[PDB]
Amino acid sequence: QALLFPLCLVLYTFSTYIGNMMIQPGMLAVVEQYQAGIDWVPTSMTAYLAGGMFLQWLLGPLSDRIGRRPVMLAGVVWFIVTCLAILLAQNIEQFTLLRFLQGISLCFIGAVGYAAIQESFEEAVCIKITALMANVELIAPLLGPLVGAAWIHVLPWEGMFVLFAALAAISFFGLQRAMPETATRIGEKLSLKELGRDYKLVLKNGRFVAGALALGFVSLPLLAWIAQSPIIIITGEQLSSYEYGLLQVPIFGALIAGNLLLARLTSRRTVRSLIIMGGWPIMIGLLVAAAATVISSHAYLWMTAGLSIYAFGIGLANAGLVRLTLFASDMSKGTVSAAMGMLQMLIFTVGIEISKHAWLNGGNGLFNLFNLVNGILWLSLMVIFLK
Ligand SMILES: O=C(N[C@H](CO)[C@H](O)c1ccc([N+](=O)[O-])cc1)C(Cl)Cl
Ligand SMILES: [Pr+3]
Ligand SMILES: [Pr+3]
């Protein structure tokens, strides 16, 4: 009678994702309007992502105790408020803090929204819902930059946050009528001390931590590209929004192509073999982008080629490493998931800032060299992690 639930959670998820991806290309208009330096462009995403790791560890056990409905709806509202509130920001510092506060809305998708999905639907229907969510996450970083660039060509950046709030508002009402209460520990006491002990315990698991760290390092080059390609292409290479948008296609296309191959190969390949398989394009790609731009600072097409090859590798290898990492720890999936979520966003957050300084100080060469060491760190962890 009511499938409005998973569909509205999907719409919310989509909106928090363009909440990131549509904004990055817009950030050039943003810093122009505040008369802030281009160094604040990538920090927009850093702050957004830092918000995404802020309440991770807490929302799951909390929504288990007080209800999935109140917590989930609260997150959607928080998203609406913080999106609107950024229109009143008076300087880039204030703009960035709000990016952070908006980012907290991310924590609600996995820890409480998705947990409600698992506690509602048949193990078969739940698979198709998760498939749709994965498609959304795969399409957002492709569509976002393109839509974002075409948006600021005709409309003010403030408009984008109105769009995000509107979409999430639609999504609020759909969840208000169709989301069931599935929390199993309603009324039970939540102990922050026991929660801390849970997390101290998961982190002592060496094999788990290596896999979690590896996921962060390996995805970092992709996130660093999202954060910085606007300043790399437009302000750096003196190119237009058209080239910026176009260079996105081979990169996230290859990501998609990588996940598609993974779909076809999975019945005749173990997770272990697909990771080793992905390792070749992951490494070759990063190597190519680094060598080329060391050789020639402005070889941005070689750079895009390298990153496409790398992105294909990620498509093939990551989901399998996610699975192994999840099952490398025997503790509650809520706890294990939030732990691996926080570990990798720690790497993204710090990594984008280091990346930004690499590019500001040494240009494309440094940008790509830093990406290469991240791949090497993944590779290093995989030699130990695989057995
Ligand atoms: O980097 C990737 N994404 C993962 C999730 O699979 C990463 O943890 C992530 C999560 C959220 C996000 N966001 O909404 O801005 C970005 C990256 C790709 Cl490997 Cl799919
Ligand atoms: Pr306990
Ligand atoms: Pr416990």
From Swiss-Prot:
Belongs to the major facilitator superfamily. MdfA family. One of its GO terms (molecular function) is sodium:proton antiporter activity. The keyword Transmembrane applies. It is a multi-pass membrane protein. Residues 60-69, 118-131, 175-213, 264-274, 323-333 are cytoplasmic. Inhibited by CCCP. Efflux pump driven by the proton motive force. Confers resistance to a broad spectrum of chemically unrelated drugs. Confers resistance to a diverse group of cationic or zwitterionic lipophilic compounds such as ethidium bromide, tetraphenylphosphonium, rhodamine, daunomycin, benzalkonium, rifampicin, tetracycline, puromycin, and to chemically unrelated, clinically important antibiotics such as chloramphenicol, erythromycin, and certain aminoglycosides and fluoroquinolones. Overexpression results in isopropyl-beta-D-thiogalactopyranoside (IPTG) exclusion and spectinomycin sensitivity. Keywords: Antibiotic resistance, Cell inner membrane, Cell membrane, Membrane, Transmembrane, Transmembrane helix, Transport. InterPro entries: MFS, MFS_dom, MFS_trans_sf, Sugar_transporter_CS. A negative charge at position 26 is required for efficient transport of positively charged substrates, but not for neutral compounds. This negative charge does not play an essential role in the multidrug transport mechanism. Optimum pH is 6.5. It comes from Escherichia coli (strain K12). Gene3D superfamilies: Multidrug resistance protein D (1.20.1720.10). It is found in: Cell inner membrane. This is Multidrug transporter MdfA. The chain crosses the membrane at residues 2-19, 41-59, 70-90, 97-117, 132-152, 154-174, 214-234, 243-263, 275-295, 302-322, 334-354, 366-386. CDD domains: MFS_MdfA_MDR_like. Residues 20-40, 91-96, 153, 235-242, 296-301, 355-365 are periplasmic. GO terms for biological process: regulation of cellular pH; response to antibiotic; xenobiotic detoxification by transmembrane export across the plasma membrane. GO terms for cellular component: plasma membrane.
